Amino acid sequence: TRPAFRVGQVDAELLDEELVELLRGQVREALRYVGGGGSGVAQDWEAEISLALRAVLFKLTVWDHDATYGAALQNLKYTDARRDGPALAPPSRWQKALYGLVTVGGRYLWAKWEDWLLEQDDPSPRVKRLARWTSSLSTLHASAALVSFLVFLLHGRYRTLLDRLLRMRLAPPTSQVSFEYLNRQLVWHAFTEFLLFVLPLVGINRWRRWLARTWRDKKGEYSFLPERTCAICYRDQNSVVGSAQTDITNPYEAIPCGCTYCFVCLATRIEREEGEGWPCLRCGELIKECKPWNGDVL
Amino acid sequence: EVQLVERLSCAASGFNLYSSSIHWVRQALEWVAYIYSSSGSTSYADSVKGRFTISADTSKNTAYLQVYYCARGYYSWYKASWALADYW
Amino acid sequence: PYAAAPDIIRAHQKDAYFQGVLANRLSDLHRRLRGARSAHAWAAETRTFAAALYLCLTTLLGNRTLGEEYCDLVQVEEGPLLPSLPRRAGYILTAIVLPHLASRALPSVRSAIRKRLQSRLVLRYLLTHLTPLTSGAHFRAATLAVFYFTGAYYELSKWVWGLRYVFTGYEVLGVLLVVQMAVRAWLHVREQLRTAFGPGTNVDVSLDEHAFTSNNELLGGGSSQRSLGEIGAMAHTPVLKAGRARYDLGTSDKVMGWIKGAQQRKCTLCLEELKDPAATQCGHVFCWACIGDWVREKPECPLCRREAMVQHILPLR
Amino acid sequence: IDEHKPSLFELLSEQQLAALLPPTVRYLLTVLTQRYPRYLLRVLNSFDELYALAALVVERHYLRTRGGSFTEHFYGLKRERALVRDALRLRPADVWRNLLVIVGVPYLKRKLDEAHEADAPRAMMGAAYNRPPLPGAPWRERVAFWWRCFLRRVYPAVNAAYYLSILAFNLAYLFDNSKYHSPFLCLIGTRVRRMSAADYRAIEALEERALVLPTSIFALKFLEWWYASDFAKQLSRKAAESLDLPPPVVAGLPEEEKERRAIERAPVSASSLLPIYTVPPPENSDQCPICEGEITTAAACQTGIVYCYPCIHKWLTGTHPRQEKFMAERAGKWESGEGRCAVTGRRVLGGTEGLRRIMV
Amino acid sequence: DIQMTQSPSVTITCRASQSVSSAVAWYQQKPGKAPKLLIYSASSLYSGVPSRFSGSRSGTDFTLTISSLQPEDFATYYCQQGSSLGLLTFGQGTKV
Ligand SMILES: CC(C)CCC[C@@H](C)[C@H]1CC[C@H]2[C@@H]3CC=C4C[C@@H](O)CC[C@]4(C)[C@H]3CC[C@]12C
Ligand SMILES: CC(C)CCC[C@@H](C)[C@H]1CC[C@H]2[C@@H]3CC=C4C[C@@H](O)CC[C@]4(C)[C@H]3CC[C@]12C
Ligand SMILES: CC(C)CCC[C@@H](C)[C@H]1CC[C@H]2[C@@H]3CC=C4C[C@@H](O)CC[C@]4(C)[C@H]3CC[C@]12C
Ligand SMILES: CC(C)CCC[C@@H](C)[C@H]1CC[C@H]2[C@@H]3CC=C4C[C@@H](O)CC[C@]4(C)[C@H]3CC[C@]12C
Ligand SMILES: [Zn+2]
Ligand SMILES: [Zn+2]
Ligand SMILES: [Zn+2]
Ligand SMILES: [Zn+2]
Ligand SMILES: [Zn+2]
């Protein structure tokens, strides 16, 4: 029986992460058409985009008003834990500077370093030694963060390890239904769960096909793919050059066609169509059986 | 001036066939075949399929098929469609 | 006893989220200090330990769990009377440790009863459905249905120790759960009118009301094939008799010699001898059937958590 | 402290719902046309403008009575005149400007996005397709060419500027630096606030003074839940679940006199009626068949056999010394294992790129 | 395949077996001379062609109209249809 003093901070961090994600999504939409006409530019510069967004947020939210958007939504604010008393001192400039360096800059630099270490893997003794040292550093930080979270469960003062080290603490500057809606979401969740449990039982693919028929061997259009690529994988992913995701594994050939797919893909489709043959995607013919690929020998 | 002077050799002058489509059409009009130099895409008609092998070299700006007209394909912008500008 | 069922449900969901995140952190640490194989080996133990830690820093000390804090609930004993140390410790022992011990001990009891039935003196129905019947998922579902109707004790162990929730038309969930359980029973009864593996090192949890992760789960957690012989006939794949498997490493140490060491000759999923070894795209070898079931459930390698597509699993030869 | 300031999360969710509405209506219209391709086909072909008109009417009605847009009202939000209730109310000109921003700008953005996305495949098709029209072409031809040039060169920049200005105003709005969360709200001098108790009372009283409002607000809830629960993806995954299959198989697996036997054992290639060189199966399992030694860096080819990684790599590339020694006196008359599995001799689709580095 | 039939063998009419959208062009073959493009789209007049030639469409029926036939306009008028790719098919040709 004590007033809430931890959920506010947990919610503050969750909201900060959500905000960065949303702004990153806006940047993705901005770069949607740039670079030709996939991930493209936005995926290539994910780390740089995130660094820029985090720097702008830190300047606008933490540096200027001593509270991350999300800490402000919860009526919290960063305070100098070193200075005691009801005065509720603001953080010093050095505290904010170090918080920024570790949170906006340090994260980016560490991501770049780890990516570079992964690239060097293919490696040099120096690369192996550096990888070992950085794995040790990351493990040490992971242990420290876990222990700080366990302590936060007890006392609820410092949410993060960096906050504990810098002595910046989230406190409510001033006093300044929301439950009925969530209790309704419970019923929505239960009903959608029931639907997800029920529909597969009656068979939703078969009923969907019948509903499509009720409501409403020329060459197929995937012949352009190289022999490496599985047409089923290509269709189901890119709903060219062979990649790791679409390559044929366990090549099986359709009995009449001779076109090669993965064993799992071809068998699953031929079984989905039951007796009716599945139409090939490379030459359009109808397939009812498959055999292990002869592999270009007699 | 774009001139297209005609193993039958077709030499293109005034433009580079690396960045165009070359269509061979014979008359006894029947479209024989077309070739895209950039991607190497080539297609023929049923009558000439197989017996006729077409290609082109950019270095001397020439197209080989192995009266016959060569024309430059032109893809319109308004209601995009394929026409043949600069016959022969 | 002055607490509504939806508030208790939401508090439990948030507690489950925090227990799951603690377990994820612990499993990540285990995988950093030792290989992913050992981290996966102790996934269930780590999850139980994470739940026990969460309830040993919040409840065992008399504090309120983060889930209770979110929903403005106080755990009293039948606030007017907060539970004593003995009650809280007993509840933690009965709600987390006891289910794990029972789960660990269940396979032996199942095998003993299986042999006893196999010695004969409706019984064949028990023999073919012993595992579903002796699993605790359905008892937990019954507890949840009784809770959704009465709205008193979310867990069976809070009734034993008499712990209720105090502040500071949701029988639909119970109706849906009862219908789901009845349909599940009917499908098995109608016939005569795989392995779970549990989760791996990482379990998905979320604080969103619309997440559809494990913690946001109201109803029960838990045919279209052709017997694996007809599929082989269609695909011209010679299918060996059930149980018998091509290239089973338990037959001898010379079945696949390049796999050396008893640690490396057992799949991490079923823990038995590697039979029909199959390499995921990332390179890790499991039984064909085990990894097939796993990627059916979660499209992800159980060890390195890399993406695994069921179509790109390669049997070894 | 300033209650009635919607959080950026609320505003972004409301905008997501407003953006979800038009594709949803289009999909429903497409289905209904599929049923009756007689009366609704004309509507579907000119959907964008008719949806714009319907949205104009609906949003105008909601602005005049509820004070905010349809989805904004669904979220408890209203639109006030940034600068008492009369002074902050929306005048008719303000209602028309709000309609222009709510309905005009999204309509134009959808038109431009659709045009660009329809033109993109031709843009990337090549240079044979993208030949500028010579002068003297009909004005329609030149206009279409310039429209495509705009869509290809200028429009990506305009889209980036649009989204980046929205992002800048969101960032400024976060901490009361802007008072507007969107540049177009800034232009028309309107700000989205959170409805208070008085506004709800006024709306309820006006409703009382006068079966579609409940049905339209339960449709919004259902749409929001459909897209937030990711229901389509979950149902697809449940339907397109993995099938319980048996393990695959490979077809190959279960002194001139020597040359005849060697040809006899070798599998003859298909493209050329020519034998293929294949190494014998090892005597013991723990041995690379190529080098006949201990397997050091296990790697599996497309056939599932496991070799040393360097050994099988060289064998696929056709450079392994075992191949060259066997290919010295048998050039032409034999086919090496180049691009083939060493043991079975079956061709390998991925060549060397498709090798599994087995983590034992 | 798509069949392109010209009824005559002035308003020259032509018809297509299926719906070819608007991708139909007209060429002018003079005796012993290369064809000259007239209307590359259904109605887009090629540069340099006199305005007397006009192209029109109605569903699957295309028409080439010459308001005032000129003494040098005598030739064979060929209809051509191309698919999305560069697959073309000509007509029979109409002599005027
Ligand atoms: C009470 C309301 C909400 C639901 C009523 C139907 C429920 C109980 C559902 C759940 C599982 C369903 C069964 C799933 C499997 C099949 C096979 C298929 O060929 C349709 C019939 C049949 C036999 C279904 C009958 C209806 C069923 C029993
Ligand atoms: C009210 C909503 C949420 C419940 C979902 C509708 C369920 C109950 C519907 C959807 C499909 C329906 C079934 C469709 C076909 C059959 C086969 C018949 O031999 C028994 C009933 C059965 C199996 C339907 C029963 C119900 C049923 C399962
Ligand atoms: C962050 C982690 C390491 C905290 C450790 C305490 C928890 C997680 C428990 C649960 C299961 C436990 C392990 C059980 C068995 C073994 C085998 C041996 O190797 C000793 C430790 C080991 C591997 C346990 C270590 C801890 C351990 C993992
Ligand atoms: C508060 C405490 C009891 C919470 C639970 C602690 C966990 C880590 C304990 C409870 C039961 C313990 C295990 C009990 C017995 C065995 C035998 C052997 O197979 C290895 C360890 C094992 C399997 C225990 C491991 C840990 C372990 C799982
Ligand atoms: Zn085929
Ligand atoms: Zn495939
Ligand atoms: Zn196994
Ligand atoms: Zn793996
Ligand atoms: Zn070797």
Residue numbers in the entry:
A (entry chain A): 6 to 42, 55 to 139, 144 to 197, 202 to 241, 257 to 279, 294 to 352
B (entry chain H): 4 to 9, 22 to 43, 48 to 85, 96 to 117
C (entry chain C): 20 to 97, 127 to 169, 201 to 247, 276 to 300, 323 to 351, 358 to 452
D (entry chain B): 56 to 138, 153 to 279, 298 to 341, 379 to 484
E (entry chain L): 2 to 10, 20 to 106
What's the paper's own text on this?
Recycling requires receptor modification by a membrane-embedded ubiquitin ligase complex comprising three RING finger domain-containing proteins (Pex2, Pex10 and Pex12). Here we report a cryo-electron microscopy structure of the ligase complex, which together with biochemical and in vivo experiments reveals its function as a retrotranslocation channel for peroxisomal import receptors.
The density map allowed model building for all parts of the proteins, with the exception of some loops that were invisible and not conserved in other species. The Fab bound to a cavity formed by a cytosolic loop of Pex12. The three Pex proteins form a channel with their transmembrane segments and a cytosolic tower with their ring finger domains. Each protein has five transmembrane segments, most of which were missed in predictions because of their hydrophilicity. The transmembrane segments of the Pex proteins form a channel with an open pore. Because this segment comprises only five small amino acids, it is unlikely to occlude the pore, leaving an opening of approximately 10 Å in diameter. The wall of the ligase channel consists of a single layer of transmembrane segments and contains small holes that are plugged by phospholipid and sterol molecules, with the hydrophilic head groups of phospholipids facing the channel interior.
